[PDB]
Amino acid sequence: MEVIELNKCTSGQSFEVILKPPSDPSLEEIQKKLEAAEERRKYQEAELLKHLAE
Amino acid sequence: MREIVHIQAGQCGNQIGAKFWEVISDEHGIDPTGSYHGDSDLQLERINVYYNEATGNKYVPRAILVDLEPGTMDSVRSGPFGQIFRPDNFVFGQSGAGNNWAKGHYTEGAELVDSVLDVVRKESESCDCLQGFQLTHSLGGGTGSGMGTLLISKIREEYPDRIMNTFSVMPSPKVSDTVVEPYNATLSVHQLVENTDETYCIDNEALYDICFRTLKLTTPTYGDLNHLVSATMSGVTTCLRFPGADLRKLAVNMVPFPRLHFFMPGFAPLTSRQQYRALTVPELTQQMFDSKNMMAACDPRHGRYLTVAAIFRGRMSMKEVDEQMLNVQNKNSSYFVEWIPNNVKTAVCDIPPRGLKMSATFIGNSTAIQELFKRISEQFTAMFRRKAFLHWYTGEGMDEMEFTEAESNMNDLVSEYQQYQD
Amino acid sequence: MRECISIHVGQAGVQIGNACWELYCLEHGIQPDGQMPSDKTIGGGDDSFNTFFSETGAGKHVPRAVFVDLEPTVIDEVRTGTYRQLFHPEQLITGKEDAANNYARGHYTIGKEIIDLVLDRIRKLADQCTGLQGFLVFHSFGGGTGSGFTSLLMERLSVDYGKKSKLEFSIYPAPQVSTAVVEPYNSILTTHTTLEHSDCAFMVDNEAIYDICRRNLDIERPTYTNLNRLISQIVSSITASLRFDGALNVDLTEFQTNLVPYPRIHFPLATYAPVISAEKAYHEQLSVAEITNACFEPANQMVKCDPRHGKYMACCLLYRGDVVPKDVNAAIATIKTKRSIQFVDWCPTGFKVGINYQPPTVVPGGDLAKVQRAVCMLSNTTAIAEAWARLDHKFDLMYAKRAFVHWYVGEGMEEGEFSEAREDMAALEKDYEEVGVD
Amino acid sequence: MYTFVVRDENSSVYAEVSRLLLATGQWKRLRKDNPRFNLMLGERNRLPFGRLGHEPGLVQLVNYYRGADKLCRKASLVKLIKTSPELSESCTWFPESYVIYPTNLTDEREVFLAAYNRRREGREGNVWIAKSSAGAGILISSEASELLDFIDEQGQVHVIQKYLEKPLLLEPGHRKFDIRSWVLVDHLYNIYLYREGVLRTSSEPYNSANFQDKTCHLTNHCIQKEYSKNYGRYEEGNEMFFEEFNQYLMDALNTTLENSILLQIKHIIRSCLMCIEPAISTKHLHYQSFQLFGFDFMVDEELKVWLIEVNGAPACAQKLYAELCQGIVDVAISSVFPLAPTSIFIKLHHHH
Numbered sequence A: 001m002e003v004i005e006l007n008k009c010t011s012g013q014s015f016e017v018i019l020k021p022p023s024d025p026s027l028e029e030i031q032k033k034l035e036a037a038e039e040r041r042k043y044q045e046a047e048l049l050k051h052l053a054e
Numbered sequence B: 001m002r003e004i005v006h007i008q009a010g011q012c013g014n015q016i017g018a019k020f021w022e023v024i025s026d027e028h029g030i031d032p033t034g035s036y037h038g039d040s041d042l043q044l045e046r047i048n049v050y051y052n053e054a055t056g057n058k059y060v061p062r063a064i065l066v067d068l069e070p071g072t073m074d075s076v077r078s079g080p081f082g083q084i085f086r087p088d089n090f091v092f093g094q095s096g097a098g099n100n101w102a103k104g105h106y107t108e109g110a111e112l113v114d115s116v117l118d119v120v121r122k123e124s125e126s127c128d129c130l131q132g133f134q135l136t137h138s139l140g141g142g143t144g145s146g147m148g149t150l151l152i153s154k155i156r157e158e159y160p161d162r163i164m165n166t167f168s169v170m171p172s173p174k175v176s177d178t179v180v181e182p183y184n185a186t187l188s189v190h191q192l193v194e195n196t197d198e199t200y201c202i203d204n205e206a207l208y209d210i211c212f213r214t215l216k217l218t219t220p221t222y223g224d225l226n227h228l229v230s231a232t233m234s235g236v237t238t239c240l241r242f243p244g245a246d247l248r249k250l251a252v253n254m255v256p257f258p259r260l261h262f263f264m265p266g267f268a269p270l271t272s273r274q275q276y277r278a279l280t281v282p283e284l285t286q287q288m289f290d291s292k293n294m295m296a297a298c299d300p301r302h303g304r305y306l307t308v309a310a311i312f313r314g315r316m317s318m319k320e321v322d323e324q325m326l327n328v329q330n331k332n333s334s335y336f337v338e339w340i341p342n343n344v345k346t347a348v349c350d351i352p353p354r355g356l357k358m359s360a361t362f363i364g365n366s367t368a369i370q371e372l373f374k375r376i377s378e379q380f381t382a383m384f385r386r387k388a389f390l391h392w393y394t395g396e397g398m399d400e401m402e403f404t405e406a407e408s409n410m411n412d413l414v415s416e417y418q419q420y421q422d
Numbered sequence C: 001m002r003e004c005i006s007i008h009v010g011q012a013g014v015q016i017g018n019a020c021w022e023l024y025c026l027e028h029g030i031q032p033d034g035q036m037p038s039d040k041t042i043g044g045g046d047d048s049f050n051t052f053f054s055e056t057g058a059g060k061h062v063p064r065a066v067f068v069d070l071e072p073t074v075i076d077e078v079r080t081g082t083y084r085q086l087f088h089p090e091q092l093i094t095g096k097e098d099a100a101n102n103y104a105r106g107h108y109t110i111g112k113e114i115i116d117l118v119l120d121r122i123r124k125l126a127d128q129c130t131g132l133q134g135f136l137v138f139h140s141f142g143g144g145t146g147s148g149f150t151s152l153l154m155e156r157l158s159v160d161y162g163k164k165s166k167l168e169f170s171i172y173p174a175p176q177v178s179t180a181v182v183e184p185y186n187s188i189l190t191t192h193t194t195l196e197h198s199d200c201a202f203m204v205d206n207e208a209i210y211d212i213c214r215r216n217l218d219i220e221r222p223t224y225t226n227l228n229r230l231i232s233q234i235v236s237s238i239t240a241s242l243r244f245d246g247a248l249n250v251d252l253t254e255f256q257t258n259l260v261p262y263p264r265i266h267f268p269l270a271t272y273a274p275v276i277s278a279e280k281a282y283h284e285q286l287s288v289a290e291i292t293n294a295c296f297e298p299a300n301q302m303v304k305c306d307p308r309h310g311k312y313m314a315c316c317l318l319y320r321g322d323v324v325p326k327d328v329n330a331a332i333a334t335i336k337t338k339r340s341i342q343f344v345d346w347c348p349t350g351f352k353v354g355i356n357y358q359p360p361t362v363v364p365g366g367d368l369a370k371v372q373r374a375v376c377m378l379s380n381t382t383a384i385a386e387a388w389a390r391l392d393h394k395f396d397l398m399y400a401k402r403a404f405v406h407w408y409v410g411e412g413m414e415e416g417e418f419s420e421a422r423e424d425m426a427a428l429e430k431d432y433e434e435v436g437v438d
Numbered sequence D: 001m002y003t004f005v006v007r008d009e010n011s012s013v014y015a016e017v018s019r020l021l022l023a024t025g026q027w028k029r030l031r032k033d034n035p036r037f038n039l040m041l042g043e044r045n046r047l048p049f050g051r052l053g054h055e056p057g058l059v060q061l062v063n064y065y066r067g068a069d070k071l072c073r074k075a076s077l078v079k080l081i082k083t084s085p086e087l088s089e090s091c092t093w094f095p096e097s098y099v100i101y102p103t104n105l106t107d108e109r110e111v112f113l114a115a116y117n118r119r120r121e122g123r124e125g126n127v128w129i130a131k132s133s134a135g136a137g138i139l140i141s142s143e144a145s146e147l148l149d150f151i152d153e154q155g156q157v158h159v160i161q162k163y164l165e166k167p168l169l170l171e172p173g174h175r176k177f178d179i180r181s182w183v184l185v186d187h188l189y190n191i192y193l194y195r196e197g198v199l200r201t202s203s204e205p206y207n208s209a210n211f212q213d214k215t216c217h218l219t220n221h222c223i224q225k226e227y228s229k230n231y232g233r234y235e236e237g238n239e240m241f242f243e244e245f246n247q248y249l250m251d252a253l254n255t256t257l258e259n260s261i262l263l264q265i266k267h268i269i270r271s272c273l274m275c276i277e278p279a280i281s282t283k284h285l286h287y288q289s290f291q292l293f294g295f296d297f298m299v300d301e302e303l304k305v306w307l308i309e310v311n312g313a314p315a316c317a318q319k320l321y322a323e324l325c326q327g328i329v330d331v332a333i334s335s336v337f338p339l340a341p342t343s344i345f346i347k348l349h350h351h352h
């Protein structure tokens, strides 16, 4: 039961108590993901329109 | 500003649509001349969802009236609220469709469709952000069924990423105009399977039995049946017409599989004329989930609910609502699929319908709906196996193969409902 | 002084953010017009509160915040609300139609078209900072924007601000206050793509906030306003150290240093007490020991779970009000002899303590009663993994039938991203077990 | 209408409780994966406690206390007793025990040998017994060399404890026995002792000079009915109930079952359950727990009671299934989910 690093100021104080010691994707890659999903959307809508044209 | 464009096609579609705008116009305080005269700001908060704001603070419905003969729409124009519809939005021919899906879809209807899309395009070009479309029609006739599904096909081509909703009256031999109604209903159902996001299935037999057995109407009329449909359309659209979300959010939460988007609606109370009695929350809940109060003529105890949405209207105990709803689920959990957690959602609205202290509308995506498509399929095959009445259709350019494919599409849809019921 | 930028995404993030800045203003003495009478340095200053508020020459104190929603009805509340004068238009970004509770729609379809605009508005706030610390990102798990667009924003923030810390305040989905059925999908999709981009995340379960409102505030059917005011109290207790003079959690990096020794395990459990009903006749003010003891009661946790059956990796006690270190250590001793507090063998069994003398501020007319002292405990327990298990299980029930999957595929997402996300969660659940159980 | 689920089909006990629940016409059974339940008869291993109490509007109850395995595990019970100040290392009613990990894997090997060498030097009885939780595999031996070598051949944690060389022997027969007490803890952590116990007796004369034949040393119901040749001679199924055993203690030892044994049993049950109460109580939890425990006791020729082990998934005696299972529904289930005496349990009051 020890108290360490007791810091005090006008608005409060802080301290530590030890009870026991111990024992990314680039900007380019993000654009590719975003544009790949947009391409699959375009392909799906093309097939729907091709379906409606038949 | 999430505007909805309303379309009503054919006799049934225009008579039901007429009453619908009659009911909600009252709820939003719009009079027969489009002038607002309510007393609550809640009426106008989402008024632009269905009405356009014209000069002089006039509210004009965003509705397009379509038919292949003039008779019915002349009635609407002469009806109670007939003056409120934009005159340019009346689009009609003179030939009629002879209760013939082929005439509405391929011949007579195709001659008139382009002019209808010009009006649709006009209403959309004035929408800040178009939510989607709703169509009221019957499946048993020729115009609403054949031309209605043709309109849906051309609306999906021009607005592929907008929600398409319909209120579809399914034919029944007990409330029948002609014997070819199964032919027309089977041809339309496949169109709906492909091209609608949500279809509220309204069976005329359920409406009839409700008017006779429950409402104690000795001799029901189409007008009486339309009273039920009006009240139901007002209930299911409360989510959209008052604060509390949009069509695509509803579809996302109600449709787990693209083709199984056919809903059973329900309404409560349904009182015969003991009509002034207050209705408690438990009573609302017991009736709303009772088959007798459902309008698809399917026993939910024969299948299972994929999703359920319930809307309560009036000033009531929201705490007491949750208690009763959770009481219904937790007392019949064998009729709810266990692989969609929390598939029963409830919403409250403070504004009740005219003449009711409180009410409840019920929107269920149930596999029991396959009984409806089974009835139609059996009636279809009873005639098609003898090619009875086909000449009305082959005479308009159709081939027997198109009927065989519609038959198979229907039986596939039934089989798809059957696999999820187990 | 180093600035912090707050980002609010979706309805949950916007409405919660609106409640927080309301509380922040009442705490720092800022009026709805932005004026701050106590700020004697007009139009400038590097005080602690300046980490969250910039200043104009006219004396206005402007939040370092950005609000983002793909639909404008929630943000229009801020534009015409009580504190409308605080923000200027560039800070409030709104689309025309939401993501329909569809992760893929928020991340891909609509996100791709608005992401550059958001980063541009954030860049403008960053340009006012002389030493930006990082970002605090508020959002829901279940919303299509809160989940889908947030994950995209966190990826770009890591690219545009590599060396900057990012913390989340995430709302965990609860059926009692939700009409959406696909939220398990969205929660797991957004956790998967956000995991490697978030340094520390505070999950708040609506179920827990809901029950605290009914149990402690006697609200029969809590509203979002009730939930958000309570949530902003907890958020205020957590961010107070960045806005006031102090020595514990003075910058965003110290949140990871003190709460997250293992990076993927960065979801601390928040516990708060006391929550007293204002409508009460007059409550007996609780002692330091009683409010501290309350931090180990499951009923006051932001996520319902049983810390008795996990292991602790860290633990901070944030006190506000009449509290002196003598009473804190006395209560801590009393609790170690009664409670089951198991620490991991490779972590010290200690408690970092911070005391702020200014007691909790309460919104006039709110539901919370004024208390002389309050505490928020931040503890990294493996017990919070219970929440992942619950969520992953619901995910498995629906995904086994592919229910609702077509909605996501239809917006351009591949089906494989579902299983890729689910396997990442299964690895996350395994990490918690390796750290906590024997 | 209350709903419950069954997730352990092998539970003779709760199979009867499920039979009784349905017989009331007020309980409905659901599939084993339906989350909308009031009561869960959960599985033995890896019960998903984390998923309980998160269904809106459903009070949920489960028949297992999360964390009670500390008491019902061989190695765990030893650790709990030796490290819990409430029980202390000097606990007088639990045999001297040590946790011994096999050499192929803290561990108490050297501590055991020290106390062993002390007994060997002081001419005292130095007979120990080795066992584990992965057995049907038990060994009784007086040489430490055999005990340790037997564990290394295995691969699971074991426990070595003193073997009671002076057990109380019923007569006629000159035979060993053990006592099974059933204890039910409800959601309020009330400790209820079933008024009916069972002595699982050995039908073979206890032989103290031959621990190789484990038929007169191990009083397990399965061993006596498989490796013993006098099964069912003195009492049906090697099961003597309290009525007969009490009458015996009066005719022979001139005492009662209550004064000589039951007081100690009640004290031991309380000490064990009060100890772990702060760790397993569901008083302030989002769900509720109850559980049936099976305490096994030993009795020496001094009428001192010794605790053997605690079973968390115990079976019952065939003659007491009806009375006990009904009692489980009365105090443990219907107490939380009421329906539209002279209790069969003995409430052991205590301070929570």
Ligand SMILES: Nc1nc2c(ncn2[C@@H]2O[C@H](COP(=O)(O)OP(=O)(O)OP(=O)(O)O)[C@@H](O)[C@H]2O)c(=O)[nH]1
Residues within 6 Å of the ligand: C009, C010, C011, C012, C013, C015, C016, C069, C070, C098, C099, C100, C101, C102, C106, C140, C141, C142, C143, C144, C145, C146, C147, C171, C172, C173, C174, C177, C178, C180, C183, C206, C224, C227, C228, C231
């Ligand atoms: N605590 C709290 N939770 C909220 C609030 N608003 C919404 N939620 C929760 O957030 C989830 C829904 O996500 P939203 O934030 O509303 O959706 P969104 O981020 O706006 O994304 P969209 O789908 O485009 O609308 C549900 O679980 C709600 O319970 C709020 O104000 N406070």
Ligand SMILES: Nc1ncnc2c1ncn2[C@@H]1O[C@H](COP(=O)(O)OP(=O)(O)CP(=O)(O)O)[C@@H](O)[C@H]1O
Residues within 6 Å of the ligand: D095, D129, D131, D135, D136, D161, D162, D163, D164, D165, D176, D177, D178, D217, D218, D219, D220, D296, D298, D308, D309, D311
């Ligand atoms: N220290 C000891 N001294 C004397 N006998 C002992 C003993 N430990 C165990 N026994 C004997 O072993 C038998 C019980 O063994 P134990 O209970 O450890 O195995 P087990 O747990 O697989 C059977 P159950 O769990 O059903 O009671 C009793 O009949 C008892 O006579």
Ligand SMILES: Nc1nc2c(ncn2[C@@H]2O[C@H](COP(=O)(O)OP(=O)(O)O)[C@@H](O)[C@H]2O)c(=O)[nH]1
Residues within 6 Å of the ligand: B009, B010, B011, B012, B013, B015, B016, B097, B098, B099, B100, B138, B139, B140, B141, B142, B143, B144, B145, B169, B170, B171, B172, B175, B176, B177, B181, B204, B207, B222, B223, B225, B226, B229
């Ligand atoms: N509920 C209801 N059903 C109708 C109404 N009018 C017709 N129907 C049903 O609709 C089918 C006939 O279709 P109809 O609308 O008259 O054909 P259309 O004018 O060519 O579209 C039959 O099944 C009728 O039972 C009506 O006003 N209300």
Ligand SMILES: [Ca+2]
Residues within 6 Å of the ligand: B095, B111
């Ligand atoms: Ca013509």
Ligand SMILES: [Ca+2]
Residues within 6 Å of the ligand: C039, C040, C041, C042, C043, C044, C045, C046, C047, C055
């Ligand atoms: Ca200043």
Ligand SMILES: [Ca+2]
Residues within 6 Å of the ligand: A024, C158, C162, C196, C197, C198
């Ligand atoms: Ca990073």
Ligand SMILES: [Mg+2]
Residues within 6 Å of the ligand: B011, B012, B141, B177
């Ligand atoms: Mg007609």
Ligand SMILES: [Mg+2]
Residues within 6 Å of the ligand: C010, C011, C071, C098, C099, C143, C145
């Ligand atoms: Mg939203």
Ligand SMILES: [Mg+2]
Residues within 6 Å of the ligand: D309, D311
């Ligand atoms: Mg055992």
